[PDB]
Ligand binder design. Sequence first.
Ligand code: XFB
Ligand code: XFB
Lengths: 264, 263
Amino acid sequence: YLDRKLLTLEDKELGSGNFGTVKKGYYQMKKVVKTVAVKILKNEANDPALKDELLAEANVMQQLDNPYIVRMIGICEAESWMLVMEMAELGPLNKYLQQNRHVKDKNIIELVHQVSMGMKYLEESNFVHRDLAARNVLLVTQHYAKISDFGLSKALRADENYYKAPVKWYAPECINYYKFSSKSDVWSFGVLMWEAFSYGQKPYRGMKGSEVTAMLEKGERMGCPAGCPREMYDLMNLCWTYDVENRPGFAAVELRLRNYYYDV
Amino acid sequence: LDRKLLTLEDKELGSGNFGTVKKGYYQMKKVVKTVAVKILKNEANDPALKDELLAEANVMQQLDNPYIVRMIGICEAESWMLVMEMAELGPLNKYLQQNRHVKDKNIIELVHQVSMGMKYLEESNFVHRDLAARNVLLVTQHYAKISDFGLSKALRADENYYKAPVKWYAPECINYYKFSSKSDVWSFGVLMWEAFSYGQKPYRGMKGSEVTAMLEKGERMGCPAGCPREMYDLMNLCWTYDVENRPGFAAVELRLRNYYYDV
Ligand SMILES: Cc1nn(-c2ccnc(Nc3ccc4c(c3)c(C(=O)C3CC3)cn4C)n2)cc1CN1C[C@H](O)CO1
Ligand SMILES: Cc1nn(-c2ccnc(Nc3ccc4c(c3)c(C(=O)C3CC3)cn4C)n2)cc1CN1C[C@H](O)CO1
């Protein structure tokens, strides 16, 4: 638990969500101060669902150590509950690409490849993310991506490869059977890839959840983004494999991205 | 079709005498559509395989029914390819082999859908000539479709049979090379037997000549374990020796609909 006295928050929020606010801050550490991004729960965290989510979020991040995952500094209880993370200065991947249409496809391949390495680590750690979307990828630089937002994440039971409980990111077995696996994160990764090469457009634009579900059950898939490398669109369709057992894991996905970046 | 708009997955879904079946993705008007692609072996050097694929496609282009696999098109590239709408779960026999939990009511539903596809083919005056469980494809566990029209024939206006897989063939096919919708009904009975046997092969361990003599003696395959009695009775009606006395698919479809409604 962090000392609210060692934390300075900037008044102007970086943004907001259903949960409350994200603020920039500075946290005094040993000798230097470190720039932090602070997730702050709305209305003094009166909502127990928000309090539960933040505590589970922190519990998961405390266990993870990987260069492509956002590091948690700690949690602070004062005026509201706050989650203190190492600042990734450029912010969410989708908003950044929306405002930077000049980013090259080779650049995008690099960033989604780093996501796949973060997710390979999570997969080998037997955690499922369950909210893998472009909005939950944070940019340290234009060439350094990190995964954040573990509010929905779960550590898997040692005897099963799925957890049994954002529909546009969810695989069929999540919608049909409430079963979340690393393979279901791979499906979401495909949508995240589609968002990245669409410079941050929303997937399945203008469709209701039930309409997305029927489209996928018919065997249809989102089309290829303008200017998207063909091999990357082929990889998205492999991520959108209907059958869980046939869909690739993150080991295979990471290797495919590594090989294709080498080719570019 | 434009080979540039088709992506094929390396790992085949399976193979046969003709070559391979691969999963693919075809760019449509706006979305991409998941396809199953029949690919001829050895750059389609075999003329019999090339002729079978073009006949297959000529038949499929004419058919429009929810219980028949839809053809997207043909692609002439590294080999000749037949591009179809993907039926995700694959052939009926292999599925039931790996899913013994499937319930009899469920199997009744699946063979009834085949009988509706075949009633459409019958009223269309096409003979399938290869109606077996392996040629039924599952879209879901509750939605079956007929495929594999490589042997199918459009009937002449003046006759109800074509004159040219023995274990699926009616006596008049073996004895007289005569193929009618009634001979498809005989095959459907074998297909029903396969389905309620969870994908076991019919006449296990017998040569074709031995199958033929068995049927000419009036013997038939026995009832599969746990098969509903009315369904085994319907199989025996499908195996009516006399082609004129054997039911058509109108009557067969009706029997299956009325028996399904009884549960
Ligand atoms: C759990 C979490 N960690 N985390 C984070 C971690 C490390 N560094 C940064 N840096 C940073 C820099 C500039 C930023 C933003 C963030 C930002 C927002 O976050 C807006 C969306 C609320 C808007 N701008 C301009 N952020 C943000 C969240 C929560 N969010 C993420 C999802 O998009 C929705 O809830
Ligand atoms: C003409 C034709 N159409 N067609 C088709 C059409 C639409 N959708 C699908 N989906 C699908 C999904 C999973 C599948 C398979 C197929 C599969 C095979 O086909 C194996 C048998 C070769 C193995 N797996 C796992 N297939 C398949 C064939 C040819 N075959 C069928 C007969 O069994 C013998 O030749």
